[PDB]
Structure 1
């Protein structure tokens, strides 16, 4: 698929707001994911033991990983579709080392949309959400194709 420049602009406009607080957004998104789909927490050997949201909020390791994750995602979005180089190392580690099924990429896509909608209602109207969803679907389609080449396709 291909996004129009207009759609990329909507995506990068709300992303510019997200970047004013990378650690906070990273925290919110990971917590939303873990509460909504607890099974995903089991994939993180470092956080697997967290029992409550309060424990999640206080975890320095969780916050640090939220930043690492958001920074990588931001770098991909800023490529506006020309992200092949960025996707390679990411697809290899998630398919072969971490073993993350495509299903889980859809779950985090929902968490991202939920948090942006909660925190940025004025910059995340229906058109902006549609553009963001399209951007994430593009990302998922490409990662899925790479998974297949790598011999996984979760």
Structure 2
């Protein structure tokens, strides 16, 4: 469980993310694909992008980044009371896209990296710890929902 103060640190940084959702999302997906190239293979619509510049120019990757961050943000804002937000995400990600939890770990590392890179002054050790705990809670709860659907990834 996170403390109220941990939630507040999470939400304080997230408000900085919301000043430029698209740009944060591009930076996070690009970092994910740079750091863990296997993850790009799950995206039929993006795996043809061969260079960082092509990835930045891609309207569809940028749109997808906003979709991703909007969903994550809606989950974080519920401060752990996220069943209704999380269920549909678990359904698609378990049964259609087939995203293992290790891949959710990789995108969590990309989120942390981008947030620190863009907001170091609002993303020191206590705020990083709080964000890591919020993302761990989300991954724990998504894994339980994966198993309820029969997916052991």
Deviation at 1:146, TM superposition (A): 0.5
Query: Partner of 1:152: helix, strand, or coil?
Result: coil
Unmatched runs of 5 consecutive residues or more in structure 2: none
TM-score, length-normalised on structure 1?
0.98
Cα distance, 1:63 vs structure 2: 0.2
What do residues 57-109 of structure 1 show as CA deviations (whole Å, max 9, x unaligned)?
01000000000000000000000000001111100100000000111000000
Q: Distance in 2 between matches of 1:48 and 1:119?
A: 26
Displacement of 1:153: 2.1
Count of paired positions: 153
> What is the CA–CA distance in structure 2 between the aligned matches of 1:67 and 1:86, rounded to whole Å?
16
Question: Residue 48 of structure 1: CA displacement?
Answer: 1.1
Residue-by-residue CA offset, 1:112-146 (whole Å, 9 max, x unaligned): 00000000001001000000000000000000000
Asked if structure 2 preserves the Cα contact closer than 8 Å seen for 1:33 and 1:40, the reply is yes
The RMSD of aligned alpha carbons is: 0.4
- Whole-angstrom distance in 2 between the partners of 1:120 and 1:15: 10
Note the residue ranges of structure 1 that are not aligned, 5 or more in a row.
none
Whole-angstrom CA distance in 2 between matches of 1:127 and 1:78:
18
Give the whole-Å Cα distance in 1 for the aligned partners of 2:130 and 2:63. 28
